[model samples]
Target chain A: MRHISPEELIALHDANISRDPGRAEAIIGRVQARVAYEEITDLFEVSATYLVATARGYIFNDANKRTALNSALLFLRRNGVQVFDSPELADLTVGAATGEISVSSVADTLRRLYGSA
Target chain B: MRHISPEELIALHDANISRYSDPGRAEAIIGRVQARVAYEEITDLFEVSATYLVATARGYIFNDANKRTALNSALLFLRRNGVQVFDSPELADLTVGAATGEISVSSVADTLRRLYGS
Candidate 1:
């Protein structure tokens, strides 16, 4: 199974989302570590929900939530389990970014949606 | 006083374009926000943008970057005044807040002053 690439994240941040800020590289590394190594077993054990929280929190300079949401869906698409985005899902994504939506909640929500696809 | 069109708005948000959930609903909401401002006789740019963002975003018409698209709906609306909304952690919070119905349109409008001068 394929996984999200670090370069893809970099491209998304640098190319599309970033509005320019500081202390960025260091925080980005935090996420890079997980997407890179957490799934060393190829079983893709790293939960997209956890990554969502990591990217959504007040860690990066800007677009952390955007990147977080994009990365989670992109991860799913790459894994061949694409879930359709919904109005509720959109709000849920925002909630995830604000640290309002729990990992368990996203997992349940995302997995349930994933089952449909 | 220019306004965004359905196609123009979609181009702004839909990267894949094919990921749309309800194209018909999406198109209707585009006109919906504009008509709202027209009917309400709203003058504030930020107000219109906030409405645009909230309505389009909450509509959740696309499966890709729906929230981001909504945030940009506000940002893009602000651009009508040739202003670019500043990107910051605070701004990020606002988008999420807006989506969850925690942030009011007036609050979002007032906050835009910092990101894009009043």
Candidate 2:
């Protein structure tokens, strides 16, 4: 019964920026992601909204997009879920980052790409 | 504990294509595939499955659904050995990737290992 914490994300952001890039290690954005997990009905969609997409806020100074996706990737992988690395996967993560597409839809497709259920 | 046979694969071709246009050619390709596998003496089930997929997918021994049958044959081989392949929603893309060269036999074997949870 593990859960992601905004505090941990701050630590992750610190590691990402090294010398502190964009600042704003504040929990505001991490909190958004934390709550995002609760807002969604499925694990797949929440992964996009909270961990992978900038919709949760590019709070980290750097690597927000890839870091977020990395976070999402690690989270799923730890649970024995795996996603195929492919063009469609890359395209969707970018779409969610730019707010050009629905994060929910992206999650649905992600489920198709890899999931237990 | 189970292994694929050239005859079984040929039978599968017939089941899929109905006509199996060139049984002789089909047997030749299947036999070659079996020989290659034997030469490798591959013990890993996933490796075996991947080998079958690559050969059948690229062999073009049948008239149609080459990749589809290729995928099926591998899955069938896995099932015969009691390995259930989950993550079937992406089954179509998996084989297509193999056929198109975007996915390699080793990658396919990794996928089988994951889907089989071992």
Candidate 3:
């Protein structure tokens, strides 16, 4: 379990998403607390959902669905799951966020795509 | 100064932005929706709820117009909670700037804190 800190996540947001430190900190705290405590277990989907939820959740000070999407892939790739980036993936990710799909479904998709990797 | 319902806020999102619709992160949306409940549970000030709402909304907890929805949503929250922050336009402006990455969260929170005294 790679423990991503609020600081590390915030840095990612700064370099990738909006550069508002205060808001970034607030967001990092929100996601970090969840990840730190295993609140959203199922590491693979949990990690991916963090990106979907954070991006679509509108927890930042900016409209960062795109950044949040990329960050989700970044987190997963860093953790060793590397085939989670594609327009179809983006569509599904956005769908999951928007309630068009389910978290379990997203997890299944991830499994099919790179769970074997 | 009125209580803005989640439906109302959702309406605001659908009306204002068009990139995406539907609740992307249901938990986060619920988290913000129930933020005030958390405050009350901890015996914190309603201002904290106001702050929480803005922070959550602006935190990219949703798929679009987070900043815009956040500002108005907080106003509605404060109104429901009996707190008042004058200068609606000013708040909107600040929120827009914040959403665009021009203003800091601390700055926005400070402005609201000054008004709500929380």
Candidate 4:
């Protein structure tokens, strides 16, 4: 049996501005994503929740931030995964060690909470 | 073998402003088109030569009538199976006679001349 990986989750988003308006967040909740999360425990699987925050912290939190977030979301979408409304509140989270990151929360909020176009 | 109908020929062109700028004609010359042309029949093939003079019969002509003969000269870029051209003087004299009327050209000069991009 294999656990779903965090990186597997992040590999599913599109950059076209027209398609991803609200900036939906996609975290892999599947069994496979979870296994991936466990495999890289030393580098990325921190805390009980494997949440991914922007690498430089929140310094670049604007549209550019959203662009990266959108990218991350696409990665999740491609792998047949859905992001949680409250991924931080989720039991598991995932990230890429060398890969870039942006706050998934912003994407989720912009998309669902605010109904961003 | 079926003779390709003229009506089928006209349906294949697209009028994208950037592509088929010629205002009035597109008589099916291959290789030079904004869209598609089929069974390239003649050099200019009437339509390709008319490339964009929307709708006024040239006000005056000497022995000049608007006919198909002259159009063949303007469109000789391709030498496909059906495409006709005026390469030598002899071929340029083709005249079409139909229920409508008959038309012919004198020479490639009077055989005449006429008028593209992305």
- In the range A1-61, model 1's lDDT, one tens digit per residue, is 2333334334444543433122234334543566466542312122222233223332221
Total colliding residue pairs, candidate 3: 16
lDDT values for all models? 0.46, 0.43, 0.44, 0.24
Question: What are the models' TM-scores?
Answer: 0.28, 0.25, 0.28, 0.15
By TM-score, how accurate is candidate 3?
0.28
Candidate 2 wrong stretches, greater than 4 Å? A1-117, B61-118
Ranking, DockQ, top scorer first: 3, 1, 2, 4
Candidates ranked by lDDT: 1, 3, 2, 4
Stretches > 4 Å off in candidate 1: A1-117, B16-22, B61-118
**Model 4 lDDT per residue over B1-118, tens place:** 1222223222322211123213233233212332322444423222322211111011001111222212221232122223334445432232221101122122222322220101
TM-score of chain A of 3: 0.40
- Which portions of model 3 miss their true places by more than 4 Å? A1-63, B1-59, B62-118
Best by lDDT: 1
Docking quality tier of candidate 2? incorrect
The predicted structure with the larger TM-score, 1 or 2, is 1
For model 2, how big is the CA root-mean-square deviation?
Answer: 22.8
Candidate 4 off by > 4 Å = A1-59, A87-117, B1-118
* 1 against 4, candidate with superior lDDT: 1
Candidate 2 A-chain TM-score: 0.42
> Residue B15 of model 3: what lDDT?
42
Minimal lDDT window, size 10, model 3 chain A: A44-53
